[PDB]
Nucleic acid binder design. Structure first.
Ligand SMILES: Cc1cc2nc3c(=O)[nH]c(=O)nc-3n(C[C@H](O)[C@H](O)[C@H](O)COP(=O)(O)OP(=O)(O)OC[C@H]3O[C@@H](n4cnc5c(N)ncnc54)[C@H](O)[C@@H]3O)c2cc1C
Length: 502
DNA sequence: ACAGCGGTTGCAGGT
DNA sequence: TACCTGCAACCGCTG
């Protein structure tokens, strides 16, 4: 008959560099036999078949929760995957566990800001001590906005200048092994079913396993650390990394692919930063921001900071940053883009890899995002934002919204006369179309001369390649060489309108 | 005040 | 190779 200390997992699904978790552990061990520890994850079982989460991401979470539990097991504890909505769940477990303290990592997102505040109100209402920590991002956005006179920086170089005069907190290790800790006595839910708070098995989280592609990126802290060290092994590659030089269409990833791990917080962005810094010092010839690997981490920090200031960051309407652009509805052309049936092989190959594997290269993301928006289809960046939210393992509210606005030249980036060619952009790095042959296998017999542009080959040729256009592979839905120039003007028109308000 | 400047990742054509 | 200019000319930041 003791009191309960709760750490609440949401993001930051790791033991390493988790001050919010460490504080629970170091309190408990420094006050032996007076406490029970409940590291919890609150799962809403109602939202398992809501469109905007693909099966691939459900697998990632399932694997992450299973790892987190295995890692907590080693510290003489375990994970508690409590089912229900937080609003219902907390009051019950507050009374039945006799909770003295609650901790969690902060989340700048709106849906969470209001939910956390609602919990934090209830916390005070029940006399439950609450101590939050900022460990998702390297820099706390609210300090960045403050230090820049109550306004989030809208450019990168300004942002770099603001943050490099702020202290970077200590990076922590793994919490203490819990000394003298019996399993917390079974609450009212556990009495009726002992396995009530166990990790959801695949069957439980993944309700639509036919959407599941190859498991190229396993979830969890362990794989996050494994993949990081793997990348940091070639300290030369790390040092001279330049984002634009990385191929969008290489068969194996040209970049680190730590974004899903950074998204869920299986990898501490602080630790990745710290690990990179010491490599920089060891490698005399090394790249500088924005193109550097550390620069990429800073871009994450940049998009986060601006997103904290605007709760309408995911929308055009009501957005302090977003240029107002008269986007047009096209349910047909949206359907084609979403499933990789545009008729542009390069665009299709990327979209198909996204749906199948849940990750695509940044420049590949950039290529398809252009095509949908100002590039060709003139469809809103909010539309592709849904597709990405559904299909990305690294789905990040702030990063997704920020880069879509960057792309469509709604915010941050403005040189709209730079338009990605769905035909040319891919050829540079993949002259043979190995990427297209893999993901759009219909056209795998096509020569490198017209595999990027099948509409250039005759009917006899089409037959000889075993792929007749209109049957085995769609006719291109629009003509890029025509539409992009009309869209360039459409941009300028909207750009003028906007100054006429400012 | 308005103009010069740099700005993660355009394309084509060229050396 | 990894640069070069042309195509039009965008924004925010700085002084
Ligand atoms: C329209 C569009 C939507 C995007 N949506 C997301 C999203 O939902 N979630 C997401 O994590 N990334 C998103 N990206 C940004 C970027 O493409 C990815 O962060 C990157 O491709 C992830 O691969 P990586 O881990 O190998 O990155 P690396 O090149 O290896 O860089 C390492 C880390 O730096 C960070 N980073 C790199 N580029 C960016 C950037 N553009 N903006 C912010 N952080 C960056 C990532 O956290 C990444 O893990 C989007 C890009 C575009 C063009």
């Amino acid at each position: 008959q003791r009191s309960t200390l709760v750490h609440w997992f949401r993001k930051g699904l790791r033991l390493h560099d988790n001050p919010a978790l460490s504080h629970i552990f170091t309190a408990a061990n420094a006050a032996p036999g007076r406490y029970f520890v409940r590291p919890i994850f609150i799962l809403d079982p109602g939202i398992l078949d809501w469109m905007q989460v693909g099966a691939n991401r459900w697998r990632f979470l399932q694997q992450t929760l299973e790892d987190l539990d295995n890692q907590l097991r080693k510290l003489n504890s375990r994970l508690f995957v409590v089912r229900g909505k937080p609003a219902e769940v907390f009051p019950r477990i507050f009374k039945s566990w006799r909770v003295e303290m609650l901790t969690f990592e902060t989340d700048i997102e709106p849906y969470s800001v209001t939910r956390d505040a609602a919990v934090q109100k209830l916390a005070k209402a029940e006399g439950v001590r609450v101590e939050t920590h900022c460990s998702h991002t390297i820099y706390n956005p609210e300090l960045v906005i403050a230090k820049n006179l109550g306004k989030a920086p809208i450019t990168y170089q300004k942002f770099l200048g603001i943050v490099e005069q702020l202290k970077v907190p200590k990076v922590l290790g793994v919490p203490e092994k819990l000394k003298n800790m019996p399993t917390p006595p079974k609450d009212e839910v556990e009495q009726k079913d002992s396995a009530a708070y166990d990790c959801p098995t695949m069957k439980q989280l993944v309700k639509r396993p036919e959407e599941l592609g190859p498991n190229k990126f396993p979830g969890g802290e362990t794989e996050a650390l494994r993949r990081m060290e793997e990348s940091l092994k070639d300290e030369i590659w790390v040092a001279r990394f330049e984002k634009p030089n990385t191929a969008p269409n290489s068969l194996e990833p040209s970049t680190t692919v730590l974004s899903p791990y950074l998204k869920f917080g299986c990898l501490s962005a602080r630790l990745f930063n710290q690990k990179l810094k010491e490599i920089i010092k060891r490698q005399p010839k090394h790249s500088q921001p924005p193109v550097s690997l550390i620069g990429q981490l800073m871009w994450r920090e940049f998009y986060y900071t601006v997103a904290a200031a605007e709760p309408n960051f995911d929308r055009m309407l009501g957005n302090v940053y977003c240029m107002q652009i008269p986007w047009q509805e096209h349910p047909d052309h949206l359907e084609a883009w979403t499933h990789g049936r545009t008729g542009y092989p390069f665009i299709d190959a990327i979209m198909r890899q996204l749906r199948q594997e849940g990750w695509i290269h940044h420049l590949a993301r950039m290529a398809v995002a252009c095509f949908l928006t100002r590039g060709d289809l003139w469809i809103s960046w909010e539309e592709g934002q849904r597709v990405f939210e559904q299909l990305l393992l690294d789905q990040d509210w702030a990063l997704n919204a920020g880069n879509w606005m960057w792309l469509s030249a709604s915010a941050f980036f403005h040189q709209y006369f730079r338009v990605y060619s769905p035909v040319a952009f891919g050829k540079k790095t993949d002259p043979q179309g190995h990427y297209i042959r893999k993901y759009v296998p219909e056209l795998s017999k096509y020569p490198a001369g017209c595999i990027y542009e099948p509409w250039k080959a005759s009917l006899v040729d089409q037959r000889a390649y075993g792929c007749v256009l209109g049957t085995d592979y769609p006719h291109r839905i629009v003509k890029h060489e025509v539409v992009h120039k009309e869209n360039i003007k459409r941009m300028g028109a909207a750009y003028k309108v906007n100054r006429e308000v400012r």
